[PDB]
């Protein structure tokens, strides 16, 4: 959908910027090591 702030392609390989199905809370998820947080990665 329409998204001005396209920042979900700036994270390192293995991570994915997703949204928490609880209330719609944006965060990052690493499906390679199973590490997810709102805390920006560094890889």
UniProtKB/Swiss-Prot annotation:
It is found in: Nucleus; Nucleus speckle; Cytoplasm. Changing residue 27 to A: Reduced affinity for KIF20B. Residues 9-43 form the WW domain. It comes from the Eukaryota. Expressed in immune cells in the lung (at protein level). Interacts with STIL. Interacts with KIF20B. Interacts with NEK6. Interacts (via WW domain) with PRKX. Interacts with BTK. Interacts (via PpiC domain) with DAPK1. Interacts with the phosphorylated form of RAF1. Interacts (via WW domain) with ATCAY; upon NGF stimulation. Interacts with PML (isoform PML-4). Interacts with BCL6. Interacts with FBXW7, disrupting FBXW7 dimerization and promoting FBXW7 autoubiquitination and degradation. Directly interacts with RBBP8/CtIP; this interaction depends upon RBBP8 phosphorylation. The WW domain is required for the interaction with STIL and KIF20B. Peptidyl-prolyl cis/trans isomerase (PPIase) that binds to and isomerizes specific phosphorylated Ser/Thr-Pro (pSer/Thr-Pro) motifs. By inducing conformational changes in a subset of phosphorylated proteins, acts as a molecular switch in multiple cellular processes. Displays a preference for acidic residues located N-terminally to the proline bond to be isomerized. Regulates mitosis presumably by interacting with NIMA and attenuating its mitosis-promoting activity. Down-regulates kinase activity of BTK. This is Peptidyl-prolyl cis-trans isomerase NIMA-interacting 1. It comes from Homo sapiens.
């Amino acid at each position: 959908g329409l998204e001005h702030m396209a920042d979900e392609e700036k994270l390192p390989p293995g991570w994915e910027k997703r949204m928490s199905r609880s209330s719609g809370r944006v965060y990052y998820f690493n499906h390679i090591t199973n590490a997810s947080q709102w805390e920006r990665p560094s890889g």
